Amino acid sequence: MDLTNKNVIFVAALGGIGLDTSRELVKRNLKNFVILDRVENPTALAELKAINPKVNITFHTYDVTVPVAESKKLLKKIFDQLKTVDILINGAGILDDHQIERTIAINFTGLVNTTTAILDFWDKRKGGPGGIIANICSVTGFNAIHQVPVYSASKAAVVSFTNSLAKLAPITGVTAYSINPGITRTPLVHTFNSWLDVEPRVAELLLSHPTQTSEQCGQNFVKAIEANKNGAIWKLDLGTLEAIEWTKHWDSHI
Amino acid sequence: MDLTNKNVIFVAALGGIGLDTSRELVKRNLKNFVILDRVENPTALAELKAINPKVNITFHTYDVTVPVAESKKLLKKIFDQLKTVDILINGAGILDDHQIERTIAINFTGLVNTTTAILDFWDKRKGGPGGIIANICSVTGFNAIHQVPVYSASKAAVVSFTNSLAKLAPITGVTAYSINPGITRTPLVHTFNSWLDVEPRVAELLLSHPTQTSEQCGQNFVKAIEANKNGAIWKLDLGTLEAIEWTKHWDSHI
């Protein structure tokens, strides 16, 4: 998939691995790069524009926790200006098991709602042109870091949801795949809260094992996008890009 | 594990497979059987007491969507009266992908919060005696019914959360395992809403393949409880009871 002249919407582009992914994306000569984030980041925005002035970069304040009606309102405005949107990247996320409700609302519910909102413009059943959805999940969605069970569980949910989205492609015209980074040194400062404080040294311990750089992840992130494989479960761990096969324990046959 | 003289709390005992599971449980001569559900079902309550008058059956109105503080309040009342609680069964659930927020709040968030609430009385770190948690999930937690992606995703979340709970046992003293029923004829009315109506005939189609009876599931449910295997991922499909092995795609090393 050629990203040249493509219109992309990136939710939470200015955070964590999102920034390094954004840096790589803008280098691909996109036509429009729409960033939707809850918090304004003038510095990051300035850097991106400086990387490739050719790309039209616009920022819109967006809280993934708002109702679907709210998201449809904002998306309508964007589709009105761009006419078309080729890819949507859902990258909102939080890691803090002391915030149970918020973790689920941001990592799981918000992703599902934003996806549900855009389907209103992309659903081929409604005469839409279809589209592509790239969901940023996590390797914890495969096998949890049991010390942060809520975060891990919310990610397992998105890995499943994304897998389902891909299977619905023939009906909606919307393809999808998940991007699952392993442990990376992207969160500016490492120190997250474990559920019921079962392990206050989780960050410290995790960093005691092989990790990957934020840049290594960003580059593989774009490579996965260009691969454009519907239903792919991409694992971005230790600087490599690999598609894992989901084990089949049960089938619905439909 | 002998259920004789045991004190059990069952969230959503009067619904779906919960009723047939409750019928089998009461036959095991429990000391106290505490049912926590949204609305009382007099007929079901009357039937259970009639099955084994020896068991003290109590019902308390409970909405899993309430804050953890609220759950701690109710649980405190129960523990004060009973003194000890041996097992907690989280069986609240809803299947309706037209209700995105509610599905996640009931199937995922509520289970996590009730679990978080009881740990206040069971955490060995707080001098608690530990305990056992049986989470009713679903085979859709392994592999989704993509037509109801939100429901399936919420279940994948609980399968993950339960797996994490089990790994924390050495720290909390609380063991846990998941009960995952396959397609069963327990929901009185069969006709659920698919996400964005991708398939309005999901129920019809699902019932066109091999299923199991509500009673078959209930009996295997109790057998799983008696097996008392921490970290077990029980699959109750087609009348059988089997423990599946979760694939290790990634290792946190911690």
UniProtKB/Swiss-Prot annotation, chains A, B:
Lineage: superkingdom: Eukaryota
MF terms in GO: alcohol dehydrogenase (NAD+) activity; identical protein binding
A cellular component term, taken from the record's GO annotations: cytoplasm
Pfam families linked: adh_short (PF00106)
SUPFAM superfamilies associated with the record: NAD(P)-binding Rossmann-fold domains
Enzyme class, UniProt record, top EC level: oxidoreductase
Reactions this protein catalyses: a primary alcohol + NAD(+) = an aldehyde + NADH + H(+); a secondary alcohol + NAD(+) = a ketone + NADH + H(+)
Record InterPro entries: ADH_Drosophila-type, NAD(P)-bd_dom_sf, Sc_DH/Rdtase_CS, SDR_fam
Residue positions, PTM N-acetylmethionine: 1
GO biological process: alcohol metabolic process
Documented EC number(s): 1.1.1.1
Annotated NAD(+) binding sites: 10-33
PROSITE patterns assigned to the protein according to its UniProt record, in alphabetical order: ADH_SHORT
Binding site for substrate: 138
The entry's keywords: Acetylation, NAD, Oxidoreductase
Listed Gene3D superfamilies: NAD(P)-binding Rossmann-like Domain
Catalytic residues as annotated in Swiss-Prot or TrEMBL: 151 (proton acceptor)
Quaternary assembly: Homodimer.
Family from the record: Belongs to the short-chain dehydrogenases/reductases (SDR) family.
UniProt-recorded name of the protein: Alcohol dehydrogenase
